[PDB]
Every structure is written in structure tokens, then in C-alpha cells.
């Protein structure tokens, strides 16, 4: 039982840390994504 505790505890901790890093990546992509479309849209405004 005690051993399971420790093992399970570790998992939870790891999961928590994992989430954090993913969040960071997500935010980056989000910002990056937006910028791209704007540029393309601006290109359309110059297409005429």
C-alpha cells in the first residue's frame, strides 16, 4: 500500500509539471498562429 502511494504520488506530480509546459507551448503557437493570418490578409489588401 505504502509503495503504491509513493508511485501514485509521483505520477500526479509529473502530470502537474507536464501540464505547465504544454500550456506554455500552446500559448506560443496561439500567438504565432494569429500573426500569420494577419500578414496573409494584409497581402490580400495589396492584391488589387
Amino acid at each position: 500500500q505504502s509503495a503504491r502511494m509513493v508511485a501514485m504520488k509521483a505520477a500526479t506530480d509529473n502530470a502537474g509539471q507536464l501540464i505547465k509546459d504544454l500550456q506554455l507551448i500552446y500559448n506560443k503557437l496561439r500567438q504565432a498562429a494569429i500573426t500569420q493570418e494577419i500578414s496573409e490578409i494584409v497581402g490580400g489588401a495589396a492584391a488589387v
Binding site: A11, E40, I41, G44, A45, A47, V48
Partner: protein, 463 residues
């Protein structure tokens, strides 16, 4: 009067008429000395009209002369169009002679009003195990098929044509389709063998045609089907008309291709700014008004295999039954590859399909959804670290997932097994027995492509 071409770019041609003769919008123009004709799209002022060529551009130069017909593109309609194949402008391509008809209708027309609108009341039976259970059809309704490339849209549409449109009283079906010329030609010959051709009309346009042709092909099929819907003989009031369209996306693609050249800013994901209105003006004409009933089946293409694209997202609101095909299930070996979830029908109501059917459908969907959320835990935790009820749910969900697959009559060439056709009551009884907990000992292998339950019981012996 006569206009003169002043500028051509790709398929977009502008023509400068005199001040008093400027043709109106959508009017058809004939180019003298050539088989090409033009249609108006914009009025850029100063007697100049932007137009799209309805045909191929060969040997066209600036300074040529054009004559105005002062009317939209008209097509022949009537009983003499039955058993014939025609192009977009209504000319035969079957090498069987000219169509002997004098009744003609304009391609462009307004949608029916709110006052003339009807209500679907009768169910339609197809013989598909998954369609009849989780997505019932209705006579005079609307059905849509959503999938990415190579998932089985064409096979399902052909099976639907075979099941219901093969033999019914005066169905006067109609088939406005385009796609691959190999699948075409195979179809015209397949029907000519059955003799169904004397009660079908086919409008066909290849996918190598200029963007002018691919933009107006559907508006011809709709025009020909409306005449069958509205015509009445001695109070006969016509007969149920069936419509099958396989080229809806090509319409949006042609619109996108010509939008930039016509001088319009881009919107969203490289899409035209007027997507929703262009879809609406088309999908509001495919309807069953009080004077007649039209049952239509459409094929909808999903780019990049994501349903959030602006093209398939706008279409969901225009259908009564939507069947969504999933790439994962298709790659899993199961066909027809229909997603039990994300597949709904407005007729799935306890006051329409009864009480037992509604409960069976709800229970099946609940079991599948519950099994869907357990995949991450099994990925992280061992399979033994689950509740017994969860294990039962997983096993029953796997059996049910295999159970939605049946062999088709049309796809015999791919596999060799003969087709099957299961009645609704057999499906209801089989699913009721499965959810009850009987059929548990039977291995999940015996549920693949096996029609009704009794064949499952028989196949349990072998494998």
C-alpha cells in the same frame, strides 16, 4: 446592341456595351463566330460589364463582337429529358440526337416563400443498419454526407441509389453529378442494363472544365427537378421526385477561384467574403413545398479532414439528417465508416419513431460515449485497474462498434462477398438483445460484415 471584348484574364472577360444597351446581371451573351457564351457577374459602370465564359477559351482575342440575348441561360425541361445525358447549357452528349422539347426554364430563380412551406411526416427505410437506427430519414427531407477523400462517400451514395431509388412508383428521379469520368460512364452503362434509365435525367459536367462551367452546373439540375416537383396531371400533382447531387463543393471552389479575379478582398482561410449567401441561395431552393415533395441526397467534401473549416461548417444548418464519415474508423477496417456520435437527425424524436427506438438509440449513444472517455485511463493505467462495469462497457462498446458494419451490394467488386439488406425490426431486436447483456460470450470477431444477428450466431461456430 453589340459589345466588344476589351480585356480577358484567365476565364474573366470584360465587355463594353453602349450606354443604353448594358445587359442586366446574369444575362447570357453569345460570341459571334464561336461556340463560347458569357454570363454577367458585375456592372463596373461606364457601360462595362464583367463576365465569365461559359465554355472553353480557345482562339479568343480582344476586339471580337458579342450579342446580347437579354435573358438568363435557359434549359429545356419536360418528359423528353428522361433517359438522356446533357451538358451545363442543356446540349446532349450521348450522341442520341437532339432533345425534342419546346418548354424552357431559366436557371436562376427565387426561393419559395415562408407561406408555401411543408412538414415532413413519413419515415423512409433504406436498409442500412446504422442509418435506420441513429439517423432516421424522412420523405421530403434533406440528407447530407460529410467525409474527407477516400472514406466512402461515392460507395454509400450508390448503395442508397440502389436501395430506394431503383424501383418505386413514378419516382421520376434526377441525377446532377460530375467528379471522375471513370465512375461516370460506368454508371450510365450500369443503369442502361437495368432499364431504370427511362425514368431518370442526368446532367453531367467534367472536372477539367473551365471554372465557368463548374460554377453553374448544379443550378441546371435544380431547375430540371423543380419542374418535376411542380407539374401535375389530372390532379396527379406530380410524383415524389428524388435528387442526388455530388458536386456541391466544386461550386464553392469555382466561386473562390473567380472571387479574387472579380476584385474582392479575401476573408477567413483564403475564402471569399460571400460564402454564406452563396451557399444559402442554392440550398434554399432544394425544398419540398406544399405542391410537391423532393427528397435530396448531397455529397459534401471536408477539406483537410477537419469539420471546423468554413466550407463544411456553413452547411450543417441547411440539412435535416447529417451523416459524418470518420477517417479513423475507415482505417480501422470498418465500412460503412459512419461515426455513431456526431451523427444526428431531426426525426429522432420519441413522438416520431416511437418509444422503444428512442430508448435504444439513446442507450447505444450513451454506452459509446462512456467508452470513449476511458481510453486515456487504459493508456496510462493497466486494463486490470478498472471497475467491472467499466470493463463490461468497454467490451459491449467494441461489440457494438463492429456490429454497425455490413456488406453492400455495390462493393462486391472490392471484396467479393454478396450484399445484404436488413429490415428495421431486425436491427431493433438485435441491438435490444445486445444492450441487455445476452450475446456477451460470442467473440467480437463474429460481428464483422455479418448482416442480421442470426448470421452472427451462425458465424460464431467458424470464427
Amino acid at each position: 446592341s453589340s459589345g466588344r471584348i476589351i480585356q480577358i484574364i484567365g476565364a474573366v472577360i470584360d465587355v463594353e456595351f453602349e450606354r443604353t444597351s448594358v445587359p442586366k446581371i446574369y444575362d447570357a451573351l453569345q460570341v459571334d463566330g464561336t461556340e463560347t457564351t458569357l454570363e454577367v457577374q458585375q456592372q463596373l459602370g461606364d457601360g462595362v460589364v464583367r463576365t465569365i465564359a461559359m465554355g472553353s477559351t480557345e482562339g479568343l482575342k480582344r476586339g471580337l463582337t458579342v450579342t446580347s440575348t437579354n435573358a438568363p441561360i435557359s434549359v429545356p425541361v419536360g418528359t423528353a429529358t428522361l433517359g438522356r445525358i446533357m451538358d451545363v447549357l442543356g446540349r446532349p452528349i450521348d450522341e442520341a440526337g437532339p432533345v425534342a422539347t419546346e418548354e424552357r426554364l431559366p436557371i436562376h430563380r427565387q426561393a419559395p416563400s415562408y407561406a408555401e412551406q411543408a412538414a415532413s411526416t413519413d419515415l423512409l427505410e433504406t436498409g442500412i443498419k446504422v442509418i435506420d437506427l441513429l439517423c432516421p430519414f424522412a420523405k421530403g427531407g434533406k440528407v447530407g454526407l460529410f467525409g474527407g477523400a477516400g472514406v466512402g462517400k461515392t460507395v454509400n451514395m450508390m448503395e442508397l441509389i440502389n436501395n430506394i431509388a431503383k424501383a418505386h412508383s413514378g419516382l421520376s428521379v434526377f441525377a446532377g453529378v460530375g467528379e471522375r469520368t471513370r465512375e461516370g460512364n460506368d454508371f450510365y452503362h450500369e443503369m442502361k442494363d437495368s432499364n431504370v434509365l427511362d425514368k431518370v435525367a442526368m446532367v453531367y459536367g467534367q472536372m477539367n472544365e473551365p471554372p465557368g462551367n463548374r460554377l453553374r452546373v448544379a443550378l441546371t439540375g435544380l431547375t430540371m427537378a423543380e419542374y418535376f416537383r411542380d407539374e401535375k396531371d389530372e390532379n396527379g400533382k406530380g410524383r415524389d421526385v428524388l435528387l442526388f447531387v455530388d458536386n456541391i463543393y466544386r461550386y464553392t471552389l469555382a466561386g473562390t477561384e473567380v472571387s479574387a479575379l472579380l476584385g474582392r478582398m479575401p476573408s477567413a482561410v483564403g475564402y471569399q467574403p460571400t460564402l454564406a449567401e452563396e451557399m444559402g441561395v442554392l440550398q434554399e431552393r432544394i425544398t419540398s413545398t406544399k405542391s410537391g415533395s423532393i427528397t435530396s441526397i448531397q455529397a459534401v467534401y471536408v477539406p483537410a479532414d477537419d469539420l471546423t473549416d468554413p466550407s463544411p461548417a456553413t452547411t450543417f444548418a441547411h440539412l435535416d439528417a447529417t451523416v459524418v464519415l470518420s477517417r479513423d474508423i475507415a482505417s480501422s477496417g470498418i465500412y460503412p465508416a459512419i461515426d455513431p456520435l456526431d451523427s444526428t437527425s431531426r426525426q429522432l424524436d420519441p413522438l416520431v419513431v416511437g418509444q422503444e427506438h428512442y430508448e435504444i438509440a439513446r442507450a447505444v449513444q450513451n454506452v459509446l460515449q462512456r467508452y470513449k472517455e476511458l481510453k486515456d485511463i487504459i493508456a496510462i493505467l493497466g486494463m486490470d485497474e478498472l471497475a467491472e462495469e467499466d470493463k463490461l462497457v468497454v467490451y459491449r462498446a467494441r461489440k457494438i462498434q463492429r456490429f454497425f458494419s455490413q456488406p453492400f451490394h455495390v462493393a462486391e467488386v472490392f471484396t467479393g462477398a454478396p450484399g445484404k439488406l436488413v429490415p428495421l425490426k431486425e436491427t431493433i431486436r438485435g441491438f435490444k438483445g445486445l444492450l441487455a447483456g445476452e450475446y456477451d460470450h460470442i467473440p467480437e470477431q463474429a460481428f464483422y460484415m455479418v448482416g442480421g444477428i442470426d448470421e452472427v450466431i451462425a458465424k460464431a461456430e467458424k470464427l
